[PDB]
Structure 1
Amino acid sequence: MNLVLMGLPGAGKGTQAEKIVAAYGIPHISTGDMFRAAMKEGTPLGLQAKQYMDRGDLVPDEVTIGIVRERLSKDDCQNGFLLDGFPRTVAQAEALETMLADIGRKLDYVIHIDVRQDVLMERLTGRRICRNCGATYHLIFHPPAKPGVCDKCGGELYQRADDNEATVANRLEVNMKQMKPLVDFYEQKGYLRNINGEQDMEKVFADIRELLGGLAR
């Protein structure tokens, strides 16, 4: 099962991805996470990605396509995979068709999680993450028991560098311009499936699971 989760920042891609991989046992490939990992490690790519990420801009296509190509070549992707946040430009989608064909694979579904921009703004600015264990909370939608403290480990909660209002405004704009044309691109190939992301988390997951059940039918 080869899947793509696509959506504007804050739509709930990572949230749903965790639930999906836990049910199927397939790898979760997130370009955002890979870039953050390179940043922490201090590699040449992490230093380059940092500048774009901090501004809410997209990292150049050539660079992004390369790290994905390398990741998809591993044996752990033999039973399927879930691409989260890639592709997000037409150039990236065209490259993906080719990269997959090269390893003898074709996409099953491109799940587009749709949410209105005003809601997305709130989704991101209110997000708080645990500095210790990485658990995610939301000040409005799902707050911790005690303010500023992680329920899981007692760690400090903080706001991601790119989740401030100004950076979020730029992220939404560039992703809207680059990613939205992908809806049409994938509708044409028949891979696209829309999911209403303005529902409670379990309901969004149920809609996805229902969609995925059809692959086994």
Structure 2
Amino acid sequence: SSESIRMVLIGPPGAGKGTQAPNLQERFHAAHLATGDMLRSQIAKGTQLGLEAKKIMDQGGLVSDDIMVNMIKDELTNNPACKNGFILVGFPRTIPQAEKLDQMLKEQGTPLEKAIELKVDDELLVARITGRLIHPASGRSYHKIFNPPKEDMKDDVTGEALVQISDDNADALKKRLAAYHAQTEPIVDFYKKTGIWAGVDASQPPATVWADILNKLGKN
């Protein structure tokens, strides 16, 4: 095993998934699989799933549980980086999706090993979301206080300007945190019942949260 990870990283907006996923990524050289990013990449390719997703999506609807799970499957089966495990972010989001994912990873014979849930109190989140900065290109995020860029409003690797989002606000966030707890509790619960769940304290500085995770992972 060791130097392979098949896991699911969950947490509310503001917990740092975008900050940890990349650390995990480089360590295990695993594939960082984001659902929306997979959706878009597939629509670009002119694939049957991509086109089917495209038409049902750009028509005011959502893509089916199985179209998602069939795409994840396509990725495991073809993505080059999917051979040293993966890091699934933002999926599942309903029980049946967690259900069909397990039933298909089962098929593939490559089960999830961990479901890391990043924990942090809302009050801390709606306060920390106020000062986030994203390199629009890479999506590399920084925080003006907690993980500041080395140069005033500049991306560490490109020297390009960082930007803050209009939705990066207290009111808008409160609605999203509420929605998050209501829909993630059953999935968290699903992962507890199968024994792969692990809580991590996301209230700690980045490097401490990194270490906490690397430890709950059990590799090494």
Q: State the 1:183 CA deviation.
A: 1.9
More displaced 10-residue stretch of structure 1: 62-71 or 21-30: 62-71
Partner in structure 1 of residue 178 of structure 2? 173
Give how far 1:158 is off. Answer: 1.4
Does 1:101 pair with 2:106?
yes
Give the RMSD, CA atoms, in angstroms.
Answer: 3.0
CA distance in 2, matches of 1:113, 1:86: 14
Scaled by the length of structure 2, the TM-score of the pair is 0.79
Partner of 1:81: 86
Match of 1:114, as an amino acid? Answer: K
Residues 121 and 68 from structure 1, CA distance in 2 versus in 1: closer, same or farther, beyond 3 angstroms?
Answer: farther
**Alignment partners' CA distance in 2, 1:22 and 1:11:** 20
Moved more, 126-135 or 142-151: 142-151
Cα distance change of structure 1 residues 133 and 14 upon mapping to structure 2, 3 Å threshold:
closer
Matched, 1:186 2:191: yes
Q: 1:73 to 1:92 in 2, by over 3 A?
A: same
Matched residue SS, 1:158? coil
Q: What SS does structure 2 have at the residue aligned with 1:98?
A: helix
Alignment match of 1:70 (pick from 66, 74, 84): 74
**Aligned residue number for residue 5 of structure 1:** 9
CA distance in 2, matches of 1:161, 1:37: 26
Q: Mean Cα displacement is larger for which, 122-131 or 31-40?
A: 31-40
In the aligned structure 1, how far is the partner of 2:178 from the partner of 2:59? Answer: 19
Quote the residue 1:56 is aligned against. none
Find the partner of 1:157 among 153, 162, 165. 162
Cα distance between partner residues in 1 of 2:180 and 2:200 = 18
Q: Distance in 2 between matches of 1:184 and 1:95?
A: 16
Looking at structure 1, the residues matched to 147 and 94 of structure 2 have their Cα atoms a distance apart, in angstroms, of 31
For residues 23 and 215 of structure 1, what CA distance do their matches in structure 2 show?
11
Aligned residue runs from structure 1 range 21-170, under 5 A: 21-35=25-39, 45=53, 48=57, 62=65, 63-74=67-78, 76=80, 77-160=82-165, 162-170=167-175
Q: Deviations over 1:187-210 (max 9, x none)?
A: 111111111111111111111112
Q: TM-score, normalised by structure 1?
A: 0.80
Long gaps (5+) in structure 1: 53-58
The separation in 1 between residues aligned to 2:167 and 2:58, in whole angstroms, is 13
Q: Give the distance between the partners of 1:162 and 1:83, measured in 2 at CA.
A: 24
Identity of aligned residues (%): 36
Shift of residue 109, structure 1, vs aligned partner = 1.0
CA distance, structure 2, for counterparts of residue 51 and residue 164 of structure 1 = 26
CA deviation vs aligned residue, 1:33-54 (integer Å, no higher than 9, x gap): 33565799997646837979xx
Moved >4 Å (runs of 4+) = 35-47, 49-52
Contact 2:32 2:87 in 1 (8 A): yes
